[PDB]
Amino acid sequence: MKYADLELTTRGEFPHGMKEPAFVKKLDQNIPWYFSTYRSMYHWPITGDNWSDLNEAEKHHDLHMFYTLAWWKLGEGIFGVD
Amino acid sequence: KNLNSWYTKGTMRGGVPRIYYAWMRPGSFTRRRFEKMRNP
Amino acid sequence: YKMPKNMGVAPRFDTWNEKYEPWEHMKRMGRLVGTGFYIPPEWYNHFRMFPPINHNFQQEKTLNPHNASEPTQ
Amino acid sequence: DDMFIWLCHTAMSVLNPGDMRSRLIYNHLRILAESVASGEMTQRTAFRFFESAVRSPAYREIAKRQLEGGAATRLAGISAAADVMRRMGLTRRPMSSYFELYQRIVERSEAMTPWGFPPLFQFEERLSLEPRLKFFSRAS
Amino acid sequence: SWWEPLGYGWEQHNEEQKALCDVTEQRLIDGSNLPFGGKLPPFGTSYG
Ligand SMILES: [Mg+2]
Numbered sequence: 001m002k003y004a005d006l007e008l009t010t011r012g013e014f015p016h017g018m019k020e021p022a023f024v025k026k027l028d029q030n031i032p033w034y035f036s037t038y039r040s041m042y043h044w045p046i047t048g049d050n051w052s053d054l055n056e057a058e059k060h061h062d063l064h065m066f067y068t069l070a071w072w073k074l075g076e077g078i079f080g081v082d
Numbered sequence: 083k084n085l086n087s088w089y090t091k092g093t094m095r096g097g098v099p100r101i102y103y104a105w106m107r108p109g110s111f112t113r114r115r116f117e118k119m120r121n122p
Numbered sequence: 123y124k125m126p127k128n129m130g131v132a133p134r135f136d137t138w139n140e141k142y143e144p145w146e147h148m149k150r151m152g153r154l155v156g157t158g159f160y161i162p163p164e165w166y167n168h169f170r171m172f173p174p175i176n177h178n179f180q181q182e183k184t185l186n187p188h189n190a191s192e193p194t195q
Numbered sequence: 196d197d198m199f200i201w202l203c204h205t206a207m208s209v210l211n212p213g214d215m216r217s218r219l220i221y222n223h224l225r226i227l228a229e230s231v232a233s234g235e236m237t238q239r240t241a242f243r244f245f246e247s248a249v250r251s252p253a254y255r256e257i258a259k260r261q262l263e264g265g266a267a268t269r270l271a272g273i274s275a276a277a278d279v280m281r282r283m284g285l286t287r288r289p290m291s292s293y294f295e296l297y298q299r300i301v302e303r304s305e306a307m308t309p310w311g312f313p314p315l316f317q318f319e320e321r322l323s324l325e326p327r328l329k330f331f332s333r334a335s
Numbered sequence: 336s337w338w339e340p341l342g343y344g345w346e347q348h349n350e351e352q353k354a355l356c357d358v359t360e361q362r363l364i365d366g367s368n369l370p371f372g373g374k375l376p377p378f379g380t381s382y383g
Pocket residue numbers: 123
């Protein structure tokens with residue numbers, strides 16, 4: 001359904017999340033304490049049943065899940081029969 | 083009547099993670115030596 | 123001021139035993155294994171259920187020669 | 196090799212270590228031995244473990260029904276201590292265990308106050324004896 | 336995958352074969368070529 005024959009030349013690399021990052025030598029702030037000293041405002045997971053018109057949890061989870069399934073090609077070749 | 087809330091207790095260290103236990107300590111989790119009867 | 127030669131390396135004559143006593147290793151190893159992140163050595167797997175004797179106390183802590191400290195010796 | 200020294204102590208350095216043929220005390224000794232090898236325990240700690248290990252209720256008062264001065268016979272000790280080194284895989288050639296454990300005892304038999312030891316020098320501690328004067332050592 | 340490389344019961348199986356079977360049909364396992372020399376290694380050596 002809704003098919004065209006499309007050429008997609010470049011897909012970005014795998015979203016395994018682990019890629020050797022860009023290396024530097026010097027850094028801007030030479031002050032590592034800032035890492036341990038930093039606080040933030042609280043993240044509250046829930047307020048009052050967590051209702052939203054944009055359904056955020058469901059929708060975002062599924063959207064991540066989709067390209068994840070795409071890249072693993074549905075995890076369908078990896079598991080044999082134990 | 084306990085005005086300190088367990089909801090907010092702690093100190094953000096920024097990036098530093100620490101572990102917490104849902105219930106008991108993980109070592110106490112699998113009891114199989116008394117269950118499957120391996121003991122002297 | 124002259125002193126006996128090896129006083130620099132002189133052992134603590136009261137407390138040098140504590141470090142080696144079986145109960146200490148039982149407790150320490152006990153809360154180490156409890157972590158889940160340490161593979162228990164086998165001696166622990168054993169004395170886990172046969173913990174050592176209670177009331178054997180050194181002579182260093184109790185200053186009594188006449189106290190018969192050990193059921194064994 | 197220090198293992199043999201340890202076992203010599205468990206055999207000869209302890210008055211009345213119960214009946215050493217019984218599977219209970221035997222297992223104590225076995226486990227502690229395998230823990231002196233593979234460095235999991237200090238010799239001192241394993242020794243104090245052995246002598247403080249759980250044996251039987253009212254131990255001394257059952258000991259009054261066998262022993263006068265609380266010194267048991269040393270055969271069970273040596274037979275068990277050789278047995279453990281054989282059943283654990285300690286040596287490549289089987290006999291060596293028994294031979295060494297035996298030999299080291301025989302040499303100490305001639306020494307003044309042979310089966311007593313100063314508690315500091317008996318095992319690993321900060322300050323030690325020179326390798327000739329160490330107790331069940333091969334160099335004596 | 337670590338059980339088959341070391342023929343476990345090899346000396347027994349060898350004995351059974353040599354005594355009860357004709358030499359025309361028998362398979363004999365050799366311990367020398369087996370991983371530890373067909374033996375159980377000395378204690379602290381084998382990494383466990
Ligand atoms: Mg002066």
